[PDB]
Design an enzyme around this catalytic site. Structure first.
Site, PDB file in Angstrom:
ATOM      1  N   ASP A   1     -28.196  -8.965 -24.570  1.00 39.46           N
ATOM      2  CA  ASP A   1     -28.381 -10.067 -23.589  1.00 39.46           C
ATOM      3  C   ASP A   1     -28.705  -9.518 -22.200  1.00 39.46           C
ATOM      4  O   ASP A   1     -28.323  -8.406 -21.840  1.00 39.46           O
ATOM      5  CB  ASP A   1     -27.147 -10.969 -23.506  1.00 39.46           C
ATOM      6  CG  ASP A   1     -26.527 -11.251 -24.859  1.00 39.46           C
ATOM      7  OD1 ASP A   1     -25.903 -10.317 -25.408  1.00 39.46           O
ATOM      8  OD2 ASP A   1     -26.688 -12.394 -25.356  1.00 39.46           O
TER       9      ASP A   1
ATOM     10  N   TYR B   1     -28.193  -9.039 -18.169  1.00 34.09           N
ATOM     11  CA  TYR B   1     -27.003  -8.857 -17.310  1.00 34.09           C
ATOM     12  C   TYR B   1     -26.606 -10.219 -16.746  1.00 34.09           C
ATOM     13  O   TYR B   1     -27.456 -11.000 -16.326  1.00 34.09           O
ATOM     14  CB  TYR B   1     -27.283  -7.835 -16.206  1.00 34.09           C
ATOM     15  CG  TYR B   1     -27.288  -6.389 -16.634  1.00 34.09           C
ATOM     16  CD1 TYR B   1     -26.153  -5.794 -17.162  1.00 34.09           C
ATOM     17  CD2 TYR B   1     -28.420  -5.604 -16.486  1.00 34.09           C
ATOM     18  CE1 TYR B   1     -26.152  -4.462 -17.543  1.00 34.09           C
ATOM     19  CE2 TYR B   1     -28.433  -4.270 -16.858  1.00 34.09           C
ATOM     20  CZ  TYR B   1     -27.293  -3.695 -17.390  1.00 34.09           C
ATOM     21  OH  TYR B   1     -27.278  -2.384 -17.763  1.00 34.09           O
TER      22      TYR B   1
ATOM     23  N   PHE C   1     -31.305  -3.395 -20.004  1.00 37.43           N
ATOM     24  CA  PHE C   1     -30.466  -2.332 -19.384  1.00 37.43           C
ATOM     25  C   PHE C   1     -30.916  -2.026 -17.949  1.00 37.43           C
ATOM     26  O   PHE C   1     -30.054  -1.644 -17.165  1.00 37.43           O
ATOM     27  CB  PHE C   1     -30.406  -1.098 -20.287  1.00 37.43           C
ATOM     28  CG  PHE C   1     -29.784  -1.376 -21.635  1.00 37.43           C
ATOM     29  CD1 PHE C   1     -28.420  -1.603 -21.751  1.00 37.43           C
ATOM     30  CD2 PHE C   1     -30.561  -1.451 -22.779  1.00 37.43           C
ATOM     31  CE1 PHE C   1     -27.848  -1.887 -22.981  1.00 37.43           C
ATOM     32  CE2 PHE C   1     -29.988  -1.749 -24.006  1.00 37.43           C
ATOM     33  CZ  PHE C   1     -28.636  -1.967 -24.103  1.00 37.43           C
TER      34      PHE C   1
ATOM     35  N   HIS D   1     -22.752   0.881 -28.802  1.00 29.48           N
ATOM     36  CA  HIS D   1     -23.319   0.356 -27.523  1.00 29.48           C
ATOM     37  C   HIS D   1     -22.789   1.137 -26.314  1.00 29.48           C
ATOM     38  O   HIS D   1     -21.621   1.530 -26.292  1.00 29.48           O
ATOM     39  CB  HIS D   1     -22.989  -1.144 -27.410  1.00 29.48           C
ATOM     40  CG  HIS D   1     -23.750  -1.887 -26.366  1.00 29.48           C
ATOM     41  ND1 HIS D   1     -23.347  -1.925 -25.058  1.00 29.48           N
ATOM     42  CD2 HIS D   1     -24.862  -2.648 -26.441  1.00 29.48           C
ATOM     43  CE1 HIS D   1     -24.185  -2.660 -24.356  1.00 29.48           C
ATOM     44  NE2 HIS D   1     -25.125  -3.111 -25.180  1.00 29.48           N
TER      45      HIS D   1
HETATM   46  O1  LIG Z   1     -29.865  -5.894 -20.663  1.00 31.21           O
HETATM   47  C1  LIG Z   1     -28.772  -5.691 -21.067  1.00 31.21           C
HETATM   48  N1  LIG Z   1     -27.679  -5.598 -20.129  1.00 31.21           N
HETATM   49  C2  LIG Z   1     -26.303  -5.344 -20.606  1.00 31.21           C
HETATM   50  C3  LIG Z   1     -26.042  -5.199 -21.905  1.00 31.21           C
HETATM   51  O2  LIG Z   1     -24.715  -4.961 -22.306  1.00 31.21           O
HETATM   52  C4  LIG Z   1     -27.179  -5.315 -22.917  1.00 31.21           C
HETATM   53  O3  LIG Z   1     -26.970  -5.202 -24.084  1.00 31.21           O
HETATM   54  N2  LIG Z   1     -28.503  -5.560 -22.452  1.00 31.21           N
END
Ligand SMILES: O=c1[nH]cc(O)c(=O)[nH]1
Ligand SMILES: O=c1[nH]cc(O)c(=O)[nH]1
Length: 222
Positions: free
Chosen positions: A63, A65, A76, A186
């Site tokens: 997902d 942020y 990320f 993760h």
């Molecule tokens: O873009 C992201 N941000 C933070 C996360 O944990 C992830 O899985 N993806």
């Protein structure tokens, strides 16, 4: 889609044109309800604005942020501005340094990876601000599933870096001998100590790429 995403990605995502438009209708109704969404509408599909044909590595995150400023429609990555880094990105930068022996980056912006054919794809492309993984099961899954199946279908090599139990269920869609999966826990602090640290995914991906006759990725961030 032809106006929202790069030419290649528009053809690849044609099958889910209905569903992209439909998720359009979802964002409208969230603003109307007083709940909002991250990232900005102009950055929701941003991972698809770099060339589909040049993609060689797929990093699947879950997902965007939840913090305004963090989410910029690349998994990320954060805005060059933003400090401090979410501990997810810090943990990714820990491992980058351990794996490649580069010093820590001077900002959290991963666009250079995007530029060099790393697809920074979240399985879900929006999120309710300040509420983590809150747009699960609304209709993004079929859109990002379609993207992944289309990468896997290309006459071209692919490394998929899959972070977390959920990211590991995408393996069926990468069984085609041209695709290779790297799986680990993760980088989120909750799981980082269970396998992510020492996992060496950057160096391993390039080894994988070269073995398949593909050019490796310059991972170096300024
Ligand atoms: O873009 C992201 N941000 C933070 C996360 O944990 C992830 O899985 N993806
Ligand atoms: O700590 C490190 N130093 C030098 C390297 O090449 C490396 O990969 N890691």
């Amino acid at each position: 889609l032809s106006e929202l995403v790069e030419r290649g990605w528009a053809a690849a995502l044609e099958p889910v044109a209905d569903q992209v438009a439909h998720m359009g209708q979802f964002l409208r109704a969230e603003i109307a309800a007083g709940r909002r969404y991250l990232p900005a509408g102009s950055n929701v599909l941003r991972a698809f604005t770099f060339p589909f044909d040049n993609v060689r590595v797929l990093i699947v995150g879950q997902d965007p942020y939840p913090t305004p400023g963090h989410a910029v429609g690349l998994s990320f990555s954060v805005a060059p501005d933003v400090r401090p880094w979410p501990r997810s990105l810090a943990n990714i930068f820990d491992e980058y340094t351990a794996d490649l022996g580069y010093p820590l980056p001077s900002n959290g912006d991963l666009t250079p990876w995007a530029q060099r054919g790393v697809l920074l794809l979240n399985r879900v492309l929006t999120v309710r601000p300040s509420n983590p993984a809150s747009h699960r099961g609304k209709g993004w899954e079929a859109v990002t599933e379609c993207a992944i199946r289309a990468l896997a279908a290309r006459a071209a090599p692919l490394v998929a870096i899959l972070w977390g139990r959920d990211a590991s269920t995408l393996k069926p869609m990468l069984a085609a001998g041209n695709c290779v999966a790297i799986e680990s826990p993760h980088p989120s602090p909750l799981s980082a100590s269970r396998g992510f640290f020492g996992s060496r995914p950057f160096s391993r991906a390039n080894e994988l790429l070269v073995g398949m006759g593909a050019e490796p990725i310059d991972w170096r961030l300024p």
